Copies of this chain bind each other. A is one copy, B any other.
Amino acid sequence: GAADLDTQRSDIATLLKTSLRKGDTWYLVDSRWFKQWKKYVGFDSWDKYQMGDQNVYPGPIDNSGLLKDGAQSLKEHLIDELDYILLPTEGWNKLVSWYTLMEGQEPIARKVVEQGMFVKHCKVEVYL
């Protein structure tokens, strides 16, 4: 059976802080399912009045919102934080043993790569 709710909240809060390291495997979790899990375990101090309430139990991990229908395929244009959160292997494995993964879905496992990216930074223009 599932770990107590205090342990769930605490284990996952810690695991959410894991650093990206090249080659590690992380798992996508639908933002909506994760926020439901948060209400249930009382993750936020300003929304813990329903901790343990079966009326907010999140049920099996459900990444439907991330998937186009039909072979399992990710929708396009998904955005980090907005649509999904990421958990390292230990965090994903814990959630799966506690809640199960919804029947007919497979884990959405992805790798940490080093990526070049163009960004805009403010600078004092001393010369020009």
Contacts and interface: CB of A to CB of B under 8 A. Distances in A.
Interface of A: 1-5, 7, 16-22, 24, 26, 28, 31-32, 35, 38-39, 44-55, 74, 76, 78-83, 85-86, 88, 90, 98, 110-127
A55 B116 CA distance: 10
Contacts of A17: 3-4, 7, 45
A20 B44 contact: no
* Chain A contact surface mostly: mixed
Given A46-B51, A55-B119, 20 more contacts: A19-B122, A20-B122, A22-B122, A26-B124, A31-B82, A32-B79, A47-B121, A49-B115, A52-B121, A52-B122, A54-B114, A76-B127, A110-B124, A112-B123, A112-B125, A114-B120, A114-B123, A115-B122, A117-B123, A119-B119
